[PDB]
Amino acid sequence: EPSLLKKLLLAPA
């Protein structure tokens, strides 16, 4: 269920 795209979007450099 959790969004992998959201995790990628939230990671900084």
Added chain:
Amino acid sequence: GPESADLRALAKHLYDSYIKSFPLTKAKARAILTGKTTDKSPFVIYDMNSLMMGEDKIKFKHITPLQEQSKEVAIRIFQGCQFRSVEAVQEITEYAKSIPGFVNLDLNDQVTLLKYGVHEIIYTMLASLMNKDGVLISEGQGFMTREFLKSLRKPFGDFMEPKFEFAVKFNALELDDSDLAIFIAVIILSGDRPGLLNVKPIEDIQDNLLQALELQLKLNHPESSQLFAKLLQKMTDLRQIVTEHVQLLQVIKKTETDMSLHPLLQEIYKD
């Protein structure tokens, strides 16, 4: 004037970000394809024997536990394509986060824009790695022929051909990486994706990106009549490519079995 100078600064910002985000640019790919590089030449996969000879050398080390497995060639290649698509999604996501205004959008809208835009971008950038006879793979360490891909068993032999057809016509436009950086940004900031919560800020960003794209093409391709209009049509064409691709996948999900699909691609393809 003042507006125009800011559009050039935006274009340059996007190019510099594209260079940071995408290791294998069109310029670097074209050098390999044309044979104008000092680097080591790619290993050419044109038949089953050359696939066997080259696959362990160029495949990613951690797709499977032992790297040797009993899956047929067409599925092994499909798994490699997935790994590459997953890496591309991550590169595209990093690029999107550099587009001014993007990270300030509602986070769920950022997700939607990527979900519905990444494959259009993947096929755009794949054209940079293609000519009419094949495609660069494994960060330029391999080259797989179009004929070999066509020779794969019925379902899988049709996956890449529409992308080659698109690429040959797209590459005839002779875009460079500076052009592509803006084109890709325009596609990401599409306000008509399903389920967007706040369309206006997305359209406002896209409108500015479209102005930057038009000026880029007029300055960088002064003799290419109607190039901007042609690129708007390629955006429409890319949606049709993606629709057709999803259809091919649905066939795979029905006729094929034991088909592992990477979780990131599962998220993108859901609905």
